PDB file of C-alpha atoms (C1' of nucleotides) in Angstrom:
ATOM      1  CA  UNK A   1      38.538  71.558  21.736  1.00 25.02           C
ATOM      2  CA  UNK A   2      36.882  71.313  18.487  1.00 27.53           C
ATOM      3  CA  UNK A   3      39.077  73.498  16.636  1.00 26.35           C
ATOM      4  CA  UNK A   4      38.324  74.758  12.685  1.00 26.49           C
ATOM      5  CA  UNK A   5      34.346  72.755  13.329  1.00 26.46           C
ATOM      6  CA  UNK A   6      31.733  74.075  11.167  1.00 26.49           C
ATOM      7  CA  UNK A   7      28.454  73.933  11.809  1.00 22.31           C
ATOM      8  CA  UNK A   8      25.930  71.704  11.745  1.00 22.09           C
ATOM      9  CA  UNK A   9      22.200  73.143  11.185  1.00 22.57           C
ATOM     10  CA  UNK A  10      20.668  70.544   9.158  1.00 23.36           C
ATOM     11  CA  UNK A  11      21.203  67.965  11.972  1.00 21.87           C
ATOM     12  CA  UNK A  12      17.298  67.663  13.727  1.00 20.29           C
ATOM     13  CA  UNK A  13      17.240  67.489  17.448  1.00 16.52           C
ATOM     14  CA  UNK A  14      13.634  65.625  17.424  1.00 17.19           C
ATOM     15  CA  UNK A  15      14.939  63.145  14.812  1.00 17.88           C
ATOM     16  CA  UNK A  16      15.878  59.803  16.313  1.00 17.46           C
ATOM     17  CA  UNK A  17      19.538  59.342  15.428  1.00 13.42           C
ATOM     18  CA  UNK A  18      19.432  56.201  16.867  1.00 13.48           C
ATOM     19  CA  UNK A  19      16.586  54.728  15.173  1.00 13.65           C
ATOM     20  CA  UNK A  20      17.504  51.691  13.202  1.00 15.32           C
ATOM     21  CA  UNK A  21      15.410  51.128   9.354  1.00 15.18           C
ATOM     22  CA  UNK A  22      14.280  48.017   8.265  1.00 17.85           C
ATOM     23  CA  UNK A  23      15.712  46.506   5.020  1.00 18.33           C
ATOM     24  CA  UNK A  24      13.797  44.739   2.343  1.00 16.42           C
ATOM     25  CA  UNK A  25      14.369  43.579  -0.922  1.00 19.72           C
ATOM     26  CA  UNK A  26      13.265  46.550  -2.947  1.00 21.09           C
ATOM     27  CA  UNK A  27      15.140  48.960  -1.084  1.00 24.18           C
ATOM     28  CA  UNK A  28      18.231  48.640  -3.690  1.00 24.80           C
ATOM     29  CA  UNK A  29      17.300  50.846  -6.149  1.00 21.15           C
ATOM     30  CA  UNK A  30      20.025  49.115  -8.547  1.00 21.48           C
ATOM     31  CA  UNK A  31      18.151  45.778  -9.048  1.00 23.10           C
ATOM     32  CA  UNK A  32      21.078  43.761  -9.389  1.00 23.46           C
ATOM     33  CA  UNK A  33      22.471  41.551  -7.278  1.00 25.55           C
ATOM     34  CA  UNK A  34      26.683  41.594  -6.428  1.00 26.91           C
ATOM     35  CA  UNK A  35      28.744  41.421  -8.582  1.00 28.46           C
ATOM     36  CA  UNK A  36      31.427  39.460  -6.849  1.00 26.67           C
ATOM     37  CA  UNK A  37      30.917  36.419  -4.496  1.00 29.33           C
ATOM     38  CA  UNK A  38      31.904  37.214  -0.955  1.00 28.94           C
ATOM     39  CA  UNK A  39      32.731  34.777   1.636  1.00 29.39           C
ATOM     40  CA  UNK A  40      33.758  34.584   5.459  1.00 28.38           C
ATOM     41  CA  UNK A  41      35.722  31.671   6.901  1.00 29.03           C
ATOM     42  CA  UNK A  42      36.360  30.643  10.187  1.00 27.78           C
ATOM     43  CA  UNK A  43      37.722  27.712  12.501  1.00 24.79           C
ATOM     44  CA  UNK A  44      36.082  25.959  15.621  1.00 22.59           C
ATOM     45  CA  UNK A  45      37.549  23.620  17.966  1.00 21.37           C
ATOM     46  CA  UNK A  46      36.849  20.132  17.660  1.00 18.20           C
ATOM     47  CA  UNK A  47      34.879  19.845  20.768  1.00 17.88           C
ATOM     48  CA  UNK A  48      32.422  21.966  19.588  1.00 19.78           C
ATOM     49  CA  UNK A  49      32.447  19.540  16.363  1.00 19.79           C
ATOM     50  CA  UNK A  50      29.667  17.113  17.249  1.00 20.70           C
ATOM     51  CA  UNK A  51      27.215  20.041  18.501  1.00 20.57           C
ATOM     52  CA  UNK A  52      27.566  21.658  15.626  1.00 18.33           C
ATOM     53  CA  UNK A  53      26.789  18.320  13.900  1.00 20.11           C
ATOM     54  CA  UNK A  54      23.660  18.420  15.398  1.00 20.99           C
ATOM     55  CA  UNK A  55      23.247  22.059  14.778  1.00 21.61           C
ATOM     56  CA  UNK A  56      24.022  23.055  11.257  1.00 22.23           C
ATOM     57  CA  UNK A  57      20.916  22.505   9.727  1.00 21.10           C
ATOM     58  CA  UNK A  58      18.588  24.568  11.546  1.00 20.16           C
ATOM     59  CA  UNK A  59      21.304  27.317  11.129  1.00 16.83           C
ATOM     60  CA  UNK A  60      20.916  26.956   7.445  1.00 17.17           C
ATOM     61  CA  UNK A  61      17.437  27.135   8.087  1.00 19.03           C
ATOM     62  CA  UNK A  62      18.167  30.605  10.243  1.00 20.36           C
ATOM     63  CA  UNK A  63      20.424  31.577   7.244  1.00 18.48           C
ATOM     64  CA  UNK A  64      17.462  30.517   4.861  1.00 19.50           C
ATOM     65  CA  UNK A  65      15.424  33.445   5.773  1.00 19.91           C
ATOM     66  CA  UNK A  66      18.106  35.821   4.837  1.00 19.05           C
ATOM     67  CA  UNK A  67      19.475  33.965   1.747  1.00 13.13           C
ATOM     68  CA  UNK A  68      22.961  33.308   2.683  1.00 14.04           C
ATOM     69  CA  UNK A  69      24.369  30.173   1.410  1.00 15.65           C
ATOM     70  CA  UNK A  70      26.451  27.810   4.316  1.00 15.47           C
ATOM     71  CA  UNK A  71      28.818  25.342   4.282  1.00 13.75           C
ATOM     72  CA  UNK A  72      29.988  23.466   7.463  1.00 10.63           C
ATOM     73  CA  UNK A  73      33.570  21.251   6.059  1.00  8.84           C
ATOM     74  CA  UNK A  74      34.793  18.625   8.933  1.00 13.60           C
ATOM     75  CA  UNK A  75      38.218  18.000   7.714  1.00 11.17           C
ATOM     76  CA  UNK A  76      39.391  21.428   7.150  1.00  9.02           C
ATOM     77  CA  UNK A  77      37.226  22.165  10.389  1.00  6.44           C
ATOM     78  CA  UNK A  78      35.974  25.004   9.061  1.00  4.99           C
ATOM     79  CA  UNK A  79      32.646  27.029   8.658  1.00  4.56           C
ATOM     80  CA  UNK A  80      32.071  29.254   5.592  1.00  5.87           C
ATOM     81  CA  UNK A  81      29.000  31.976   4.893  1.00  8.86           C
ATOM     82  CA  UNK A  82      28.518  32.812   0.885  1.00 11.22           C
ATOM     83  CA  UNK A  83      26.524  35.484   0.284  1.00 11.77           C
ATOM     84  CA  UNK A  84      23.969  34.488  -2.632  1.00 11.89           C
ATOM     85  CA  UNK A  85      22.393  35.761  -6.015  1.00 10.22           C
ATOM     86  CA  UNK A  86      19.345  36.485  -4.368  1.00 14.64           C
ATOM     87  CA  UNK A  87      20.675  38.683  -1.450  1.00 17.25           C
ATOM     88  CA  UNK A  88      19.435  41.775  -1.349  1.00 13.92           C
ATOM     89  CA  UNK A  89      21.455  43.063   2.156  1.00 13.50           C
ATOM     90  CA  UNK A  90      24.805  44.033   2.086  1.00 11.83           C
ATOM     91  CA  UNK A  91      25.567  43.565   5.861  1.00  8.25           C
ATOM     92  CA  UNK A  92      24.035  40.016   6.337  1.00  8.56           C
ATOM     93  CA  UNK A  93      27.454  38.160   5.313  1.00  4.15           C
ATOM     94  CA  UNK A  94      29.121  40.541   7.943  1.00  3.04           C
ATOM     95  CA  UNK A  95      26.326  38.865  10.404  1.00  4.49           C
ATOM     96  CA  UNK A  96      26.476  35.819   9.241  1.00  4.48           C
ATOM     97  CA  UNK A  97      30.062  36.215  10.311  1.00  5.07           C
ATOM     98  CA  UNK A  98      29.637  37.159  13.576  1.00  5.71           C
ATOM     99  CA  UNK A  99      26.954  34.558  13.902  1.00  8.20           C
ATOM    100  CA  UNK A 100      29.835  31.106  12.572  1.00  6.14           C
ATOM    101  CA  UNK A 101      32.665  33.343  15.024  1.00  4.78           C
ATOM    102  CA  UNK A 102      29.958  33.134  17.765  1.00  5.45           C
ATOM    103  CA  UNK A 103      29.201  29.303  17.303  1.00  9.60           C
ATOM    104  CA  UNK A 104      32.519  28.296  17.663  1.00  6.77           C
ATOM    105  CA  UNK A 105      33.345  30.512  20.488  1.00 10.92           C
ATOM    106  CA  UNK A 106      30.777  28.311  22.617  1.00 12.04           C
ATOM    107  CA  UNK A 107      27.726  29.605  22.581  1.00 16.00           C
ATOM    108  CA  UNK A 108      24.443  27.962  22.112  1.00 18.04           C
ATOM    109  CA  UNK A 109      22.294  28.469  18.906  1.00 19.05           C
ATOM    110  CA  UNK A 110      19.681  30.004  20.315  1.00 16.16           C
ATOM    111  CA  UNK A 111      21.216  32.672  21.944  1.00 15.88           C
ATOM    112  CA  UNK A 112      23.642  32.971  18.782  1.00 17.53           C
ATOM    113  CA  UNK A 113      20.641  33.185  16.183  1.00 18.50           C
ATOM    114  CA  UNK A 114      19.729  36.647  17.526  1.00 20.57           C
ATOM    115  CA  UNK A 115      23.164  37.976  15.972  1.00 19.95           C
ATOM    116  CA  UNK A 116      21.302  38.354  12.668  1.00 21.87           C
ATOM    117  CA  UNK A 117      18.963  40.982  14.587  1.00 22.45           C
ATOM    118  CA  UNK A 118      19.926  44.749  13.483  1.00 21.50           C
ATOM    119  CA  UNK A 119      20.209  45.669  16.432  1.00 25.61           C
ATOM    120  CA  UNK A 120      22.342  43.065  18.617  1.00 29.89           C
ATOM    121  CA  UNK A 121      26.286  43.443  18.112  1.00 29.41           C
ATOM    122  CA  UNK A 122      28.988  41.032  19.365  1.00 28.61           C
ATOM    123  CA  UNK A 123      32.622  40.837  20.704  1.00 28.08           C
ATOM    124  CA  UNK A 124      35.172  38.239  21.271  1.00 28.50           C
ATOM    125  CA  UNK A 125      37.731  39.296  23.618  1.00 31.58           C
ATOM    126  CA  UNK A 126      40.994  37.161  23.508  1.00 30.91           C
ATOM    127  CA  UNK A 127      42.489  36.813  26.968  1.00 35.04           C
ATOM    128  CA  UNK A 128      45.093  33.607  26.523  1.00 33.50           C
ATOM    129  CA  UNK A 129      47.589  36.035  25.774  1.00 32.90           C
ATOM    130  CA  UNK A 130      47.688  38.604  28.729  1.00 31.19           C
ATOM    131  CA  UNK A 131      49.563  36.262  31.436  1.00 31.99           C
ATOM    132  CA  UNK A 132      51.272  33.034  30.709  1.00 29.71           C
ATOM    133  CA  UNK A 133      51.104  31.415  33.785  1.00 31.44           C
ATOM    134  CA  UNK A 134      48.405  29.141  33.953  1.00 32.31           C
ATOM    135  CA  UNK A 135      47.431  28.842  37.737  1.00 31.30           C
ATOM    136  CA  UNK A 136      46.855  32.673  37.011  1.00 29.78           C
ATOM    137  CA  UNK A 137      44.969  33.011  33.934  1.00 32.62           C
ATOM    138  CA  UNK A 138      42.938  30.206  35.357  1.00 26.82           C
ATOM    139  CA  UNK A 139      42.350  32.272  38.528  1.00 24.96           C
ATOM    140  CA  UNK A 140      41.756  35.181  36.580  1.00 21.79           C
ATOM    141  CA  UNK A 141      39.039  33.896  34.430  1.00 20.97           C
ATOM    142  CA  UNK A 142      37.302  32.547  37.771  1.00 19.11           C
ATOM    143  CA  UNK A 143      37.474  35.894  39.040  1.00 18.47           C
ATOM    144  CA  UNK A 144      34.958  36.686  35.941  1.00 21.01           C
ATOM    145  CA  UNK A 145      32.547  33.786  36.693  1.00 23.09           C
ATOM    146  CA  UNK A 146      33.162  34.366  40.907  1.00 22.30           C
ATOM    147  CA  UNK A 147      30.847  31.686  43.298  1.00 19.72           C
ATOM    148  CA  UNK A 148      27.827  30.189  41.940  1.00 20.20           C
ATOM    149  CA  UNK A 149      27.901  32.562  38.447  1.00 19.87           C
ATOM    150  CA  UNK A 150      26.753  35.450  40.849  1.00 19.17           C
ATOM    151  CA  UNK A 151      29.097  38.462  39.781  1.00 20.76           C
ATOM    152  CA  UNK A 152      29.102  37.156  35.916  1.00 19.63           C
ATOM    153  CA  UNK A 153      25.045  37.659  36.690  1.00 20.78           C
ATOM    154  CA  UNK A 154      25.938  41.137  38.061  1.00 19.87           C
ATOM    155  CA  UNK A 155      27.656  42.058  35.005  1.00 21.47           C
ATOM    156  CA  UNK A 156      25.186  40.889  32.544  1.00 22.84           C
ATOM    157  CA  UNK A 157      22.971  43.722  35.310  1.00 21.97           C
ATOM    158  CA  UNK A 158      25.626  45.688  34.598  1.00 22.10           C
ATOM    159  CA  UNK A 159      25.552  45.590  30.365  1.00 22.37           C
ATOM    160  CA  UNK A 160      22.323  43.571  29.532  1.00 21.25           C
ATOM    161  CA  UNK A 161      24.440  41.452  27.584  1.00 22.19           C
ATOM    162  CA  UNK A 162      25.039  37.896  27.263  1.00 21.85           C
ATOM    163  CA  UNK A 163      28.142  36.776  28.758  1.00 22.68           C
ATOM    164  CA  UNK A 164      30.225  33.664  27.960  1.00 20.93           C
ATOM    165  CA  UNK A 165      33.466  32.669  29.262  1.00 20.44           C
ATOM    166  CA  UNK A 166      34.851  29.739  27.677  1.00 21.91           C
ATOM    167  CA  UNK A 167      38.526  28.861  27.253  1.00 23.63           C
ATOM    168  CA  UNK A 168      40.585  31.797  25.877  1.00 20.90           C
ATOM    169  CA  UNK A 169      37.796  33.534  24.375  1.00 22.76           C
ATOM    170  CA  UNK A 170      35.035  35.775  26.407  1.00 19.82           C
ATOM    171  CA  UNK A 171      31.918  35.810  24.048  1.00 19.80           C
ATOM    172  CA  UNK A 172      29.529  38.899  24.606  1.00 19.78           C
ATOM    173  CA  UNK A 173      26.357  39.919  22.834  1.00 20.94           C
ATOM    174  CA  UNK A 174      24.477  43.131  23.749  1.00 22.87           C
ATOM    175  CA  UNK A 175      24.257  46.565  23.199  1.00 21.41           C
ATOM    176  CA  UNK A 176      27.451  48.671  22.317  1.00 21.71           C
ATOM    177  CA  UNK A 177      27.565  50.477  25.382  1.00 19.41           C
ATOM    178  CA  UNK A 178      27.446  47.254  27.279  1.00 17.30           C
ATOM    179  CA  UNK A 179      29.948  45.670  25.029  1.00 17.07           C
ATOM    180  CA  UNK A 180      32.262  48.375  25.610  1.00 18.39           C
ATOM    181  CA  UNK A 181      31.787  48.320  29.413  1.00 20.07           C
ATOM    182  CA  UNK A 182      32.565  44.276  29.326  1.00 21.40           C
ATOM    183  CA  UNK A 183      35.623  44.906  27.269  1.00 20.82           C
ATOM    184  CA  UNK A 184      36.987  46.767  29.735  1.00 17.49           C
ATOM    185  CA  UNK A 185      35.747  44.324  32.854  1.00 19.26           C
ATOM    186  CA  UNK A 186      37.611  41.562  31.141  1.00 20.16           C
ATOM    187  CA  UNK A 187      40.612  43.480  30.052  1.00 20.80           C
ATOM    188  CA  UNK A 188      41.089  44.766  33.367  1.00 18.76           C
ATOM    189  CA  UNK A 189      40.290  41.550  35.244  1.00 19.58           C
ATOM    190  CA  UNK A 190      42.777  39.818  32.972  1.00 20.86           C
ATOM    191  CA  UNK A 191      45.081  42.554  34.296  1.00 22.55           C
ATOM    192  CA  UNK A 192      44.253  41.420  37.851  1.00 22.46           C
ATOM    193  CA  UNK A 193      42.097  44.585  39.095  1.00 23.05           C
ATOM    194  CA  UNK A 194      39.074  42.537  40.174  1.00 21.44           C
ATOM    195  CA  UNK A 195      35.950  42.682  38.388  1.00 19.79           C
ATOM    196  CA  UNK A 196      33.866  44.204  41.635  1.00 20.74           C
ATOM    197  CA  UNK A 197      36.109  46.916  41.390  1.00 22.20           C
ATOM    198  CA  UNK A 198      34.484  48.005  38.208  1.00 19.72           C
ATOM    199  CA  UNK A 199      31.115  46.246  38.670  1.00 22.25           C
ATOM    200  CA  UNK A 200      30.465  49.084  41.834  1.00 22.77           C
ATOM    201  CA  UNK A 201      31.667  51.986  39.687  1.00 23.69           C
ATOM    202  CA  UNK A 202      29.110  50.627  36.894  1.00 25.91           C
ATOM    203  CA  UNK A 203      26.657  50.977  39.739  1.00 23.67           C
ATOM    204  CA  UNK A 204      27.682  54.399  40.967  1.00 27.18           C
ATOM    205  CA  UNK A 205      27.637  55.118  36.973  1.00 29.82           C
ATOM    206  CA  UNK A 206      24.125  53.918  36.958  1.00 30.94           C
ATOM    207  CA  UNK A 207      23.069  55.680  39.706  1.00 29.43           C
ATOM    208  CA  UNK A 208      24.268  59.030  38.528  1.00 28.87           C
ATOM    209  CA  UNK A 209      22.659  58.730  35.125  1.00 28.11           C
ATOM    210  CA  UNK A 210      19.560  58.225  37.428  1.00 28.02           C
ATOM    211  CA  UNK A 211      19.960  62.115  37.949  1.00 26.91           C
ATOM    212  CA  UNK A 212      19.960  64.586  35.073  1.00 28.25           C
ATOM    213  CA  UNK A 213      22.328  66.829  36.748  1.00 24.77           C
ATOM    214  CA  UNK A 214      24.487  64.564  38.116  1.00 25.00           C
ATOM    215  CA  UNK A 215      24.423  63.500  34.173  1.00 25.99           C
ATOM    216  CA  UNK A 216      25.479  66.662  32.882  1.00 24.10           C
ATOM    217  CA  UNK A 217      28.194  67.362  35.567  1.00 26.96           C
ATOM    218  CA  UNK A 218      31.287  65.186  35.657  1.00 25.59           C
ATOM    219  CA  UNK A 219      31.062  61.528  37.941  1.00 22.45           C
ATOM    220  CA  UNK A 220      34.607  61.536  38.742  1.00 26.53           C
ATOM    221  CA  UNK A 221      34.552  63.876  41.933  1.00 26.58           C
ATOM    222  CA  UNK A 222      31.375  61.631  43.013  1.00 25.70           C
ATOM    223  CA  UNK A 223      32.961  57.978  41.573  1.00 26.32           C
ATOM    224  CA  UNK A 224      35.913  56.726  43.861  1.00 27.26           C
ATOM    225  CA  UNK A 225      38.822  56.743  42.418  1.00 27.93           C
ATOM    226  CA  UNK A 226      39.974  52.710  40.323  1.00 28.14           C
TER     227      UNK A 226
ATOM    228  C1'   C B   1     -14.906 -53.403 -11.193  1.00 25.43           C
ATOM    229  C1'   C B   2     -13.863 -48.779  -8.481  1.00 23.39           C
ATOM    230  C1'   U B   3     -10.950 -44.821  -6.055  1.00 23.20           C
ATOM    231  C1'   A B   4      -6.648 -41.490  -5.557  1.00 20.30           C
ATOM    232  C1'   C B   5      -2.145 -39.743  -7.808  1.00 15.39           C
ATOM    233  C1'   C B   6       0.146 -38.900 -12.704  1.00 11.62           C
ATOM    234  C1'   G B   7      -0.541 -35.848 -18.436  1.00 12.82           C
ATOM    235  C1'   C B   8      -2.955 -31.514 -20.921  1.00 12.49           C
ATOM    236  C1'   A B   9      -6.397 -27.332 -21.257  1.00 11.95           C
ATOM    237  C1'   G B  10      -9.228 -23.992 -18.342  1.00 13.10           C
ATOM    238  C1'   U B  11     -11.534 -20.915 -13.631  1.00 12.17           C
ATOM    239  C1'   A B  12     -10.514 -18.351  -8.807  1.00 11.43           C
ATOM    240  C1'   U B  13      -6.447 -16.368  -5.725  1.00 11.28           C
ATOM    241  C1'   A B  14     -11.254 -12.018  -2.172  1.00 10.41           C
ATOM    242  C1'   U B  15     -16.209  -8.923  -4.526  1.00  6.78           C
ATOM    243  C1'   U B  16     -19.174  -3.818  -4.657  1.00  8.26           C
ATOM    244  C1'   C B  17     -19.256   1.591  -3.578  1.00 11.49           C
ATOM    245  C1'   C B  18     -16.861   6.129  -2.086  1.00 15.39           C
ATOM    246  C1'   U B  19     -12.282   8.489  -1.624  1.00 13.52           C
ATOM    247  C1'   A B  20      -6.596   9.489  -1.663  1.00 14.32           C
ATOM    248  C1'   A B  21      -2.243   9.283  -5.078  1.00 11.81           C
ATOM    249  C1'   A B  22       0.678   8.519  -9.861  1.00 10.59           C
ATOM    250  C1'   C B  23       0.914   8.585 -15.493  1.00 11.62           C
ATOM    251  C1'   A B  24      -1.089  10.009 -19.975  1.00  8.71           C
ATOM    252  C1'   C B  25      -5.202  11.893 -22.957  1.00 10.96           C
ATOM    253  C1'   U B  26      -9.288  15.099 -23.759  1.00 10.75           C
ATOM    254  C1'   A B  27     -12.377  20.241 -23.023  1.00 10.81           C
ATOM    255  C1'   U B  28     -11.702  25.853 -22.162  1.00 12.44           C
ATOM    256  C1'   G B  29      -8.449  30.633 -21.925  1.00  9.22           C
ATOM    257  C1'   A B  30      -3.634  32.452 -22.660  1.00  5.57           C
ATOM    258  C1'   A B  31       2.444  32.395 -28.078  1.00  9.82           C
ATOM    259  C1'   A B  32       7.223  34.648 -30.966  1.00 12.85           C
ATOM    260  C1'   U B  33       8.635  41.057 -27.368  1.00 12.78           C
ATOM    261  C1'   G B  34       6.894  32.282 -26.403  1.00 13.49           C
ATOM    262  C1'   A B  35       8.107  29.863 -21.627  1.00 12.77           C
ATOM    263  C1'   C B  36      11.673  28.092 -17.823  1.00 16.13           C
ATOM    264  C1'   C B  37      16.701  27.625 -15.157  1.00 15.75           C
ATOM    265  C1'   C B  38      21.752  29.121 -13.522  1.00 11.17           C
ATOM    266  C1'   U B  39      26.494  34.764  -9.274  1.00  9.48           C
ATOM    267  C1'   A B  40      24.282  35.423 -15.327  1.00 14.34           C
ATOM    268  C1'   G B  41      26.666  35.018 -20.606  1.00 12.23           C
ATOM    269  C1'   U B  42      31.231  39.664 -27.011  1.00 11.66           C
ATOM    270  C1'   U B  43      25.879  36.412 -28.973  1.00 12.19           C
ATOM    271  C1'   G B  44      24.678  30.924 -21.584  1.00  9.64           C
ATOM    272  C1'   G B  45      21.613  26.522 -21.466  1.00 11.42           C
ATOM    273  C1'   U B  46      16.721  23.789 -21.965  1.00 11.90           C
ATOM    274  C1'   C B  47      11.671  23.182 -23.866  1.00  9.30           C
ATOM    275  C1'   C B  48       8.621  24.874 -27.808  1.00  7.32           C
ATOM    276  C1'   A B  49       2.133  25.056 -33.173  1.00  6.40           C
ATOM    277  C1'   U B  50       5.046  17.363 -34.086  1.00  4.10           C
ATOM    278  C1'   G B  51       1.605  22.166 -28.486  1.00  3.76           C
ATOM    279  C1'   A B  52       6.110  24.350 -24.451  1.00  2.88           C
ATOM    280  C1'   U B  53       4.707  26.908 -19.427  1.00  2.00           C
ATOM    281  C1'   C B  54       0.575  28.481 -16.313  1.00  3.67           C
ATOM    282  C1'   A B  55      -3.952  27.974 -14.966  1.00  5.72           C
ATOM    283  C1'   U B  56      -9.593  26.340 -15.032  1.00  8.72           C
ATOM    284  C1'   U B  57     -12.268  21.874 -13.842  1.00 10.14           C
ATOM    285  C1'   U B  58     -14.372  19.029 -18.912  1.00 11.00           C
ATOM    286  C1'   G B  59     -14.879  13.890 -18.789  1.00 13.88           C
ATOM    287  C1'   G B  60     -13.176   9.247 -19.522  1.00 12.62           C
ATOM    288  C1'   G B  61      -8.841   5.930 -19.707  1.00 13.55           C
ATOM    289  C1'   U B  62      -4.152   2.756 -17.502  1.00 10.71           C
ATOM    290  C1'   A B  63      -2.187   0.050 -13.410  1.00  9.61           C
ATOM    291  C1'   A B  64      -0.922  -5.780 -17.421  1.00  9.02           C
ATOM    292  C1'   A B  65       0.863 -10.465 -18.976  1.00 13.17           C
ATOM    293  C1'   A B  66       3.546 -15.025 -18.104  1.00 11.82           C
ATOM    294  C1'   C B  67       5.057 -18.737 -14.551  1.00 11.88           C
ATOM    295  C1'   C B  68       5.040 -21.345  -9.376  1.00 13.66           C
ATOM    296  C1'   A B  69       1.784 -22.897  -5.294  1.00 11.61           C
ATOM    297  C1'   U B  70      -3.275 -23.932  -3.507  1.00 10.36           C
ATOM    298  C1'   A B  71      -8.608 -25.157  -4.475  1.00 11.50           C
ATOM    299  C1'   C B  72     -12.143 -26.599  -8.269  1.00 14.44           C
ATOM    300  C1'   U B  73     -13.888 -27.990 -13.363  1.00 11.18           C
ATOM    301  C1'   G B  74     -13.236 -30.504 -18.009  1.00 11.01           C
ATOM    302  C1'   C B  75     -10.647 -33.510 -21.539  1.00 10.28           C
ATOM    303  C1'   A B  76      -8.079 -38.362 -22.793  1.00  9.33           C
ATOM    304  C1'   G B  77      -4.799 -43.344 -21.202  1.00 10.44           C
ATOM    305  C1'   A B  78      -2.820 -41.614 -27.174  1.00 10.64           C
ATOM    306  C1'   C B  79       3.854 -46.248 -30.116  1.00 11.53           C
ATOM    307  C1'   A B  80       0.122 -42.365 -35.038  1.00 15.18           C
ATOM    308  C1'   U B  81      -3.190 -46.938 -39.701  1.00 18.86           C
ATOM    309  C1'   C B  82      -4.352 -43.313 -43.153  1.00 18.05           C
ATOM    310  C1'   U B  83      -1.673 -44.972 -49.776  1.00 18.84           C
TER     311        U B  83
END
RNA sequence: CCUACCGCAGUAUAUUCCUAAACACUAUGAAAUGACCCUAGUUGGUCCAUGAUCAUUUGGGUAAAACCAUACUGCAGACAUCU
């Protein structure tokens, strides 16, 4: 019920809205660089500490190639991204963000390099905080991970994202779609409706995007009911 | 009578060619809107015809000296007259 909408002829069916342009350094047409420093800080746990010890440089490397400064500090425990004189990319600190928030939620550097890629996007979904008994929680998060990985598999076929459950935090890095569709796996399975529930209406979801008129008609009367 | 050690002065401590590297010079073309560096400036800093900063190869130069140890060579056995 788009009420008082005007409309919208300039808007080109043919043109790829989701097409994603590359950046380089010319494409600023102001030829200056900021004006103000900007930095992003962030904590990691300590027993991620000696990993990253053996990590950091390579990621400065990573962060070489899109000239972003780094500073890894042991006894604050904390990871900082500067953005530089000779950036030229606006959104590369915001990556470079995501990229120190995804180290010290657990996952490995080579998966977590591909952050700075336009087109991957992460989320960290906090789920200490949504029951405080432990045997639960702890059941709960095994609920995401299941026998021998199998269902956590299953979901990454369900999002073609990367999935990692570690502690309180569950790490995913994928396509917005998928990350959207894992946010609500793990929010629900932290609310105790089990994660096969919505793993086989992902499937029936799948399955009726399949068919273009199943795609333009509603999948609720066809979807069971969750 | 001789030999070795002892004293002092020397020689060698690998040699020749090619090549790699460092430092500096020299030859050629580029200079005052001169060149370089820094989140970078109401005049920032450094170098600069007393040669800066890039090239181009033009060719040659430097990498010692002293001492110890080892091997060899030579010089002398010296209390110093000299009026």
């Amino acid at each position: 019920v788009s009420t008082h909408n005007r409309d919208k002829p300039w808007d080109t069916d043919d043109i790829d809205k989701w097409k994603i342009e590359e950046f380089k350094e010319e494409d600023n047409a102001s030829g200056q660089p900021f004006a103000e420093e900007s930095s992003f800080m962030t904590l990691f746990p300590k027993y991620r500490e000696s990993y990253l010890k053996t990590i950091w440089n390579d990621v400065t490397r990573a962060l070489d190639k899109h000239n972003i400064a780094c500073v890894l500090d042991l006894v604050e425990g904390s990871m900082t991204v500067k953005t530089t004189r000779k950036t030229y990319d606006p959104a590369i600190i915001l990556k470079a963000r995501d990229l120190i928030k995804l180290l010290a939620r657990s996952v490995p550097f080579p998966q977590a390099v591909k952050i700075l890629q336009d087109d991957m996007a992460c989320d960290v979904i906090k789920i200490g905080n949504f029951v405080t008994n432990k045997e639960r929680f702890v059941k709960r998060r095994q609920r995401l991970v299941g026998p021998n990985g199998n269902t956590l598999k299953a979901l990454e076929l369900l999002t073609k994202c990367y999935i990692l459950v570690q502690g309180n935090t569950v790490s995913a890095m994928g396509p917005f779609k998928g990350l959207k569709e894992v946010r609500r796996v793990v929010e629900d399975c932290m609310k105790n409706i089990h994660p096969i529930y919505h793993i086989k209406e992902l499937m029936i979801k799948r399955e009726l995007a399949k068919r273009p008129e199943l795609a333009n008609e509603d999948w609720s009367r066809f979807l069971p009911m969750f």
